Design a protein around this nucleic acid. Sequence first.
RNA 1: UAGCAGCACAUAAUGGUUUGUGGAUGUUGGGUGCAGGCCAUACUGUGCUGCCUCA
Length: 1281
Amino acid sequence: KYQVELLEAALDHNTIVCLNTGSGKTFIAVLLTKELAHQIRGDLNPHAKRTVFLVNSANQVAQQVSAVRTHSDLKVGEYSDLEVNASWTKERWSQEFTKHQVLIMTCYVALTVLKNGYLSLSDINLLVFDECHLAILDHPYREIMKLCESCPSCPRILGLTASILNGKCDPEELEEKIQKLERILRSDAETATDLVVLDRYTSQPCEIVVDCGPFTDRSGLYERLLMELEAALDFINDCNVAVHSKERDSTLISKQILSDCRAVLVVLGPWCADKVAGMMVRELQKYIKHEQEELHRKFLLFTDTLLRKIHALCEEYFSPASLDLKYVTPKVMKLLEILRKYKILCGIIFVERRYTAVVLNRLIKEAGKQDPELAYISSNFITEFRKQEEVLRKFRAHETNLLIATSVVEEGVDIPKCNLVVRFDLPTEYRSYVQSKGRARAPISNYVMLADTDKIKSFEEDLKTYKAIEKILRNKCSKPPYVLRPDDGGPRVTINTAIGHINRYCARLPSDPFTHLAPKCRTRELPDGTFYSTLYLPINSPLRASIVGPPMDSVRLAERVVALICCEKLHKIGELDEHLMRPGSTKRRQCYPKAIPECLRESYPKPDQPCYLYVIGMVLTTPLPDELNFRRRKLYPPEDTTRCFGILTAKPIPQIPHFPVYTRSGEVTISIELKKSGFTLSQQMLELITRLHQYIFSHILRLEKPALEFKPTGAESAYCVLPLNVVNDSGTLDIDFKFMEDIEKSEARIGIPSTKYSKETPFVFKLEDYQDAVIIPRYRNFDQPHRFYVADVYTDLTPLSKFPSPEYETFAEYYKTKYNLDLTNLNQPLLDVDHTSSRLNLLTPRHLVPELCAIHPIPASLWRKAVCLPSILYRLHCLLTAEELRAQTASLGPNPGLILQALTLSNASDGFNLERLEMLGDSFLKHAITTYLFCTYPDAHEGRLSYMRSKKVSNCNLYRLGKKKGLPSRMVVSIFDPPVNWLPPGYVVNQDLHTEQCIADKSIADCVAALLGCYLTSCGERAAQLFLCSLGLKVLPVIPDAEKTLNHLISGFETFEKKINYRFKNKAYLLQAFTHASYHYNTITDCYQRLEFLGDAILDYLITKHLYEDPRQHSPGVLTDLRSALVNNTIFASLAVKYDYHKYFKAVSPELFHVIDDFVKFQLEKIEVPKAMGDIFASLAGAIYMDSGMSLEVVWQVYYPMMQPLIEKFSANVPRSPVRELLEMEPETAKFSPAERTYDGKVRVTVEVVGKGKFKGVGRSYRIAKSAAARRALRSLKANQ
RNA sequence: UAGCAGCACAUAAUGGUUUGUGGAUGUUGGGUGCAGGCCAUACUGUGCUGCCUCA
């Protein structure tokens, strides 16, 4: 609160302020400059009034000038070099004054230019004095000020200083310095320090003093120790008189060690110090070796001699195992009593030296362990480059209740509220008292001091002096009842609870660690003296207007009454109530039945209904390349064959797009085209068709699984498949009745033929009969058929020819010996054969003696065309399901091909996957939901928006909607394994892997997302938005001084508007965008948090669209990696800094200010990423979209040039998440071990790549450790490549 | 172009052994991390193969 009070005080009247550190100094300076900068902008004659800075030293000039230039928008000018400045003339300073707006110069230069008068006193606006204390002394600032005050119209001077309280006899010296300073500056002074502010607002801590008396040892060993200390001093004197070199100071370590020894012995016990001394001796021996002078080395050896002498005296210690409070310093007993009194216990102890702190911690720990009563003890200590990391680790260990610390604890650490601040010794200066007492912020705050009885005499007057200084500092700073309804509704309301209610209401509002929530109240003054209070809620509140009540004299009455009437408005908003206050998880899986399209259901042909016939046109569009071909059997284009299959059905089949299949010839396109229609069949003919269909199916494919049994009727899939041939030589295909009936009467219909070949009736071979032939060997595998295609006839090869193996000379010998088979004809040819395809999943690309054989009835050309029949029929079922879904949802529709892409899960391993559509649909879903919420509920804050958005887009909600609309029932998940899972038509299981599929809810949600991606990529944005309404997700509609204050407050954003290359028709949205929560002066508009919600969703949807439309068509892993990279907040922050948005951003949080000040120089070189930068970056995008009338394309032309240099870099070298990257490289062999906690508190994880090694990684979190382990694994694997 | 049993060698794995080395509460060294050198059990892959589907 002090920062806001100082800012508004400086705004109201000329202010003098005493600071503590340079951060606040620069901060208040630049902040007031920004606040009053509106008066400087504009090269207009009636107001050409500038701002000037006066400094004493060049180094500070450079520091401040650079800080202002970097973080300010106004151009800056410097006139520091006195000789150069003085070597100038009036007409050349003229253009210098005209050029820059902010001027910085040294004291001598300032006095020179003021003396000459060029810098008009009326042209200065904010005369800021740095190190204002110099004005007290005989400094040129006095002359400068008498000059300025001589003018009629004067600037708003400000004095900034930090050297106050440095006096000796402060109770009167400070008063005189303050009075003389203020009368010179003719202004009011305000002061603000952490402790004084905390005590002013709370005044909770209580101070306590504890007296201690000296204690000696009966053994007198203490005196022995003093005499060895004196011996050490004598040795140091001997070294001093014999240093023998002015440039050598190697004795410093020696006197430092002796100083530590005497200090620790006098203050506390020596045993801890003596024990810890050995570690320093381990380095001291190295220093001894490093020592060059033999005499000095000998002295340092005597230093070791002394240390071991004390070690020798340590033998006199009695029972070192436990001290029993018999040899410790009496202060230890006092400390133990203090600790026991409260024996929570969040205690902070202060001590002088670091070594003293270490030994004190050791002593306290040992006492706690030895004393059984000491059970609450949990102590730690505060104090190469590793030590800094250790300090950070110890900061993370802040949860310890007892912390010992040295003087460094006064700053640089956000210690929580403490209930017990122990001061082990008398503080040296009032400032130390301030910093030390400024930490006991707990309610039960006890600031306890430990002091020797003798020294209390001085400490008493010191305490008096300190409290007097605090008192003068404080003094200088000082200088009907509401009811819901008449009868019922809830509890009564009292006047005193109003402040508490307002406070908790303020606490309810959203905030981040950098912001602070607090209302502002002040009294309007009245001539009658009955000033009335006015209240202002934070900018994020739903309403922004002054709340007032009747005018009363009393402050308490006015404040409570204004709070009470405020509660009326809070309830009108609805903030007050009657009291005025797993599913969707990867684990869950369900089995669902498959569904057959309605067009295919009830398709059994019958004579009393006309029937339709479709032809399965097949064309070899893309034959396999010759180089790829290794099997080398000749290609078989099915178009040459006059025969072709077709589907006979009783109900028309809707059209479906052409689709491919992959077979021997390669990629063959299918066309299920209706060629003939409106024709019945005879009864007997119908039985012929049906029996032949069963015969062909069963025997050709051999899929008569005993679990299944045939049903001529009553099965859901009852569509017939038949062959066709050109009939009557008319070039028109038809059902070849003659061919079917001839095959039906074939003698080789069942079983192998028993040929009657003999020497009198030998076998005769006819090439034409074997031109197209499938032959079944008879002799081999009786009752176990094996079919082969005829490749070609090798007339040159005969049974009498030479056999390959040396076991037999000829094939005839092989047949006569291994099987004893007679051949009637000896001089007859042989032919080559090929094995019938054992594989049946053709849905995706994976890249003999004729006498013994028997001719199969069906020709091999038709057999080859039949091998694709199951694949084609299954794909037909899939496409028909997809088309039915598309038509139902339509009732310019989306392509069923994309629908198929959206309905197939990745587990199926199908060539058509389900990721790109998923990603696009998910992004669009988020954007649509966010836009709907923004439009439907204008009066809502970020908490409500974010919670409702996450609830609406919740995966459980998506699962519920999908199941409600029946969407999950349509996907395909199982890999196509027809031998196991396929249920062919006419066959059903006779009393699950056939009629049921198990799918996870995650996959269901992914499919629903893909559907959205499909519709967005096909039917356009409007149709995609309408799709959610079709799904039921409601996202479309059902179907006094403002101008002058805005005109002033807009300041100079025009120079930014030219950078963004765009101008809004309404100026309110710029202010909406950049209005931070802390800059409460803007009472006209809302904050930026509301614009964050819309801006993020806009930029996410735009970036996802741009990545998806990339013609490279990266894999889903790359897409996910790129999405995470582009959406990363560090990236958005870097982009904001690259385009200097921070130069125009305005905020009040000093912590945020310092963080940004560091962050900006970090990027200027080219580390905490400030969240505000990303927030403003998103909010600007939201502003562009809001003014553009819901036109995304306009936002794209604005932001694409901004993003263009980054996407090129990322696409050129995509950063791949190590986790998913490893999972993709080794989806099965990579196994991650459970989380293991190491002794240092970190988590160790082991990843095992089966067959490639185990890798261990350590990290603060399980995810980080996994990432490190994956990185190590990938690095090893690539090194091994 | 099928199935299966041995052999050479690489691998990391679960156990140990031993030389060196580390900061550490180090009551006078068993708490723990990383290099070399060995012993046992066990996994995968290319070859040396061998038998055995079909001709």
